[PDB]
Amino acid sequence: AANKERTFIMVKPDGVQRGLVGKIIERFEQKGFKLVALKFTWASKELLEKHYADLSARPFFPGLVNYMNSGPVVPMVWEGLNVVKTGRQMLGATNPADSLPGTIRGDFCIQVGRNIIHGSDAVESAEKEIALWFNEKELVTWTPAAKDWIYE
Amino acid sequence: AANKERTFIMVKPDGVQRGLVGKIIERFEQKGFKLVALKFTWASKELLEKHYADLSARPFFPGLVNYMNSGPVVPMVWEGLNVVKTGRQMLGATNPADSLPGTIRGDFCIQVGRNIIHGSDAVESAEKEIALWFNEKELVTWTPAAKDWIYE
Amino acid sequence: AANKERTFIMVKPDGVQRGLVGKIIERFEQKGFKLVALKFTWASKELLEKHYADLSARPFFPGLVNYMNSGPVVPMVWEGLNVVKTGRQMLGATNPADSLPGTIRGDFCIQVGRNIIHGSDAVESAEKEIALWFNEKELVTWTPAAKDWIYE
Amino acid sequence: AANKERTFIMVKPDGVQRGLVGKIIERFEQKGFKLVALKFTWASKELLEKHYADLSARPFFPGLVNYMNSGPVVPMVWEGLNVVKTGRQMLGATNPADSLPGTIRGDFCIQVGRNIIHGSDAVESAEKEIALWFNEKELVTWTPAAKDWIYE
Amino acid sequence: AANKERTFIMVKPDGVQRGLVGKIIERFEQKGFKLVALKFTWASKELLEKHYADLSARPFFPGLVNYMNSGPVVPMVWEGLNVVKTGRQMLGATNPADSLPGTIRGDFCIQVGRNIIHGSDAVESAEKEIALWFNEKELVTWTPAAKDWIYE
Amino acid sequence: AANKERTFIMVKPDGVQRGLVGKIIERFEQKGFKLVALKFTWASKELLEKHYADLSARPFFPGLVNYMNSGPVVPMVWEGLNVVKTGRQMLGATNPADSLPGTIRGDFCIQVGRNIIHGSDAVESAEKEIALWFNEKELVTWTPAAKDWIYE
């Protein structure tokens, strides 16, 4: 129930370009979270406008959609107790300048427009993002051998 | 075209269960190789027997297909000059016992039946494997920013 | 004197099971702390009940003892300026979800009941714990060659 | 010009003696910061007192200059958006005791007098320090291939 | 049975002094070998002379014993399929200069007289060494949760 | 005498561009070798033609001089027992395709014209290269605290 919460994590074009895919996945594996879905893909503007629908009436929305469609991305779904919230703590503050050393953004990037990764900000939106990026078919259910040493 | 050679690499169920996905991906990214495709999935037996078609007459063929259908896998495609042969060197000998330290199998596993990873043995087999596991829609073509620093 | 303070650090059953022993010891070594004692053992309930004597009346007490007796543990002693306090900081908050990235619990575990490690909460309790877990003969006294580059 | 800010970072004698030069450099490279200058040298006292001019009235000033002249150092300049302040965050609090895990001092050292590294505290001091330690001939101007993936 | 083989691995005084304890243990853990015994101790000459009994007549014998008695050591027991032989492979050649990169000696040391680690040369000698260094009571028997993903 | 042998190691333009400076230095520090000189610089064609004088009458010499003058390089001098020979083993085969995993080239690059690093091939040429790249002033003499644990 609580251990079955899921979040959407995506490596952005700059994360892929800078060779940080393996490193980012390692952080989540290490922590004990469970990989549920993963894929390498070039997001379409139609999909990005959906993903960024809330930036619609904000200045320079097109430039955001064009940047995000400027290279391949790595969408993922991780499962675990409090993964949405904990996953965001792990990524660090959205604005890299505010990210602490030890977090993904704090260790690997500098500017907010090139902040290498995305993570759902709430359970509700994680629910929305996952359904937008993956078919229920792409979500894999399995059981880790070490499950009992991770959760009581 | 030389630098465009592609090979199929797959993290087996034991690799996923032991949390080695990011580490394996990282070895390829740091080397200079280009990720072309990636997904997390549970392989069906019908797909496994195709993938294993060559071992059809083998007495261990049934248990093999059986084992590979016992947990999720991470198939992927990497591109780069001579990647089939070099990808093989990186993985190390098929029997971990012969794999040298520094290789993936040599560093992370012990026995042949739990050798954490698969790699195409030749271009002709890489082509078949890639086509077996991926649809052409899933192979992403993009250009790494450091390409001229990797290849002349 | 201040530099001779010691604390008791112990890898719990889940840390051993999840293969974090070397990683945890590494964190203390790279920091500059001196290893004073180390062993691998399966702790008896008698011993665990003395270690947890203060919680004897709690309703969870018996469950806690059975768990700590469910797998081997790695008890150790570290020495250095303010090691009890700094030791705690390096471990992170007891509840991993409150542990920040960069700490041992922040990077490697998720739930409080599976929080992989223990560290004395005070000089007083560290003294008590060391006496409980080790004999005088097990505490090694030596001098690090890098001593003058770690301390003024 | 924003992204062209520069700060002075120096590996102190204890950092060199403890073999932390590559690790320190790696933290800056992975973050996205650009190396502008670097050298290995034994600093004279006359240079140290200039570098430490501000602490002239300090009772610990003499021993400080003394200590910093006791082994070789690795001065360097890094460039990047907001590098003075961010470089400071990365290093962690000046007193390692207050430095958090994840920072350089928090992860690698224990006491203030052996705090392995120096970082400019402000732009005005970075400018002076850079000019004190390096000749203009030694500051290299070049462009990283991934610049557009780090800054917009 | 074949999987129950054990070997004796010991970190020498120089490995402890150079802070390689956690790194060395890490190599064995990530590989899949099971930790059976571990301790930190200062070895007596009496004990060292029994460990090196075969070299009693060599002219260097006394110098070797004095050196091995000059700092604490970390004796341990590892268990797994072909561990004595694979253990040796992971350590590299006795003389570090002949040790290949990726091995423990190849990556971390230089001269034969300061070769940081020891590993039994055969099943026969491993049995003898374990009895010399540990009591029956110090050998821990447990089952790794990942066992079925390491062995067929 | 033998422990005082030195070699010239230089990170090439592609090594700097790919952010491998810290990593390469770490390998040498880790091994136990001693840093004697280090600097970040843009090599002049006049200096490169001297360095590559033996490629004079070979095809496409100019293209080599232009590539090597296409970005900053990191020249270094390391000191240690058999450092020239051992340093070359650590770098791996010149042609990356022949480099074994575990070596610098085997882990980080692909093609011979983009092989990230240079190392003197003999004591005689190390002697020549060092004098070409550094003034006797730039060579720092110091003594590591751990010297006695590295050499007998």
From Swiss-Prot, chains A, B, C, D, E, F:
N-acetylalanine: residues bearing it: 1
GO molecular function: ATP binding; GTP binding; kinase activity; magnesium ion binding; microtubule binding; nucleoside diphosphate kinase activity
Active-site residues per Swiss-Prot or TrEMBL entry: 118 (pros-phosphohistidine intermediate)
Result when mutating residue 88 to C: In KRn3; lethal due to loss of phosphorylated active site intermediate
SUPFAM superfamilies for this protein: Nucleoside diphosphate kinase, NDK
Pfam families named in the record: NDK (PF00334)
Annotated positions of the Phosphoserine modification: 125
Superkingdom of the organism of origin: Eukaryota
EC annotation from Swiss-Prot or TrEMBL: 2.7.4.6
UniProt-listed CDD domains: NDPk_I (cd04413)
Reaction equation(s) it catalyzes: a 2'-deoxyribonucleoside 5'-diphosphate + ATP = a 2'-deoxyribonucleoside 5'-triphosphate + ADP; a ribonucleoside 5'-diphosphate + ATP = a ribonucleoside 5'-triphosphate + ADP
PANTHER family, per database record: NUCLEOSIDE DIPHOSPHATE KINASE (PTHR11349)
Reported function: Major role in the synthesis of nucleoside triphosphates other than ATP. The ATP gamma phosphate is transferred to the NDP beta phosphate via a ping-pong mechanism, using a phosphorylated active-site intermediate.
Note: Mutations cause abnormal tissue morphology and necrosis and widespread aberrant differentiation.
UniProt family annotation: Belongs to the NDK family.
The protein, known as: Nucleoside diphosphate kinase
Source organism of this protein record: Drosophila melanogaster (Fruit fly)
Gene: awd
